[PDB]
Design a binder for this molecule. Structure first.
Ligand SMILES: O=C(CC[C@H](NC(=O)c1ccc(C#Cc2ccccc2)cc1)C(=O)NO)NCCCO
Ligand SMILES: [Zn+2]
Ligand SMILES: [Zn+2]
Length: 287
């Protein structure tokens, strides 16, 4: 069957939060069947543990932020995108500060870390959620939609357009390395308000409103929209189970992505859990 997956070994990384500029240790730990992804702030006294699910998303300014009371874990989207990408169902993530490290601005480092810990298949069927009926949410000129589709595909447009199928196209090769990005004008403002403190050309693409300022250039011709697809995959993983359907994003950010998840969850007629006792017949394959 398509089994649930966790990490083989504990693995650690160090980095800096994009927004906070704070040094943070990130420890990924194997977890048992039906755990999901749980975060653990190990700097707080007492430690605060926060499941990576839709209901725990509290703020959605420039990143997905998990909250419990007055305690936050923000910028979970790139790490969760890596998890989704490698099909990791269960893991503990222990963090020494409020923000996940930015690493190189992409999911690449996290993908490589997860693989370096080794994957461990677990003897329990992996539960997917099938989209049975179209579900969409909008607000102004933003739109977020799930459409039925026997597989998993993402199409996204921003202010430009990319479509990726995760049967034909490798998350690792074509999406994982896409770095976050910002406009100088924006970056200047955020720095003035004590934000983006961990930002640099080493973990973010910088453009004015003309050209890429990074000396070494782009990793993909359409890196910007590819990164937005990466973010949506991460935000969609807060569902807590892998999706069988097509997601269409039109200028959709963290807030509207979480709103789509909430609507889908509450609209039970639109979805159903399914497992695959035969990996050959399954619409989604992992490594
Ligand atoms: O939609 C987006 C991108 C999606 C977003 N990234 C961000 O917010 C984001 C914010 C700030 C930075 C920076 C910086 C820096 C670079 C060099 C020196 C000093 C500082 C990079 C990314 C993200 O990755 N969300 O998950 N708009 C660009 C935001 C600003 O125009
Ligand atoms: Zn964002
Ligand atoms: Zn991002």
């Amino acid at each position: 069957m398509i089994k649930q997956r966790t990490l083989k070994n504990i693995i650690r990384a160090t980095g800096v939060g994009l927004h906070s500029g704070e040094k943070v240790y990130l420890t990924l730990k194997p977890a048992p069947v039906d755990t999901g992804i749980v975060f653990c702030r190990t700097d707080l006294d007492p430690v605060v543990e926060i499941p990576a699910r839709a209901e725990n998303v509290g703020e959605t300014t420039m990143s997905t932020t998990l909250v419990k009371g007055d305690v936050k874990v923000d910028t979970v989207e790139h790490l969760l995108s890596a998890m989704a990408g490698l099909g990791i169902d269960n893991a503990y993530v222990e963090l020494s500060a409020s923000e996940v490290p930015i690493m190189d601005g992409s999911a690449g480092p996290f993908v490589f870390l997860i693989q370096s810990a080794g994957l461990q298949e677990q003897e329990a069927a992996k539960k997917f959620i099938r989209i049975k009926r179209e579900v969409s949410v909008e607000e102004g000129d933003k739109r977020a939609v799930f459409v039925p589709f026997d597989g998993f595909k993402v199409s996204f447009e921003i202010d430009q357009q990319a479509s990726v199928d995760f049967s034909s196209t490798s998350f690792v090769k074509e999406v994982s390395r896409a770095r976050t990005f910002g406009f100088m004008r924006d970056i200047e403002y955020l720095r003035s308000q004590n934000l983006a403190l961990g930002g640099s050309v080493e973990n973010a693409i910088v453009v004015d409103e003309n050209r890429v300022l990074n000396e070494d250039g782009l990793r993909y011709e359409d890196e910007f929209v590819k990164h937005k697809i990466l973010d949506a995959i991460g935000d969609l993983y807060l569902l807590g189970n892998s999706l069988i359907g097509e997601f269409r994003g039109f200028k959709s950010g963290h807030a509207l992505n979480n709103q789509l998840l909430r609507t889908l969850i509450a609209d039970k007629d639109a979805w159903e859990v399914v497992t695959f006792e035969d990996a050959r017949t399954a619409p989604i394959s992992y490594m």
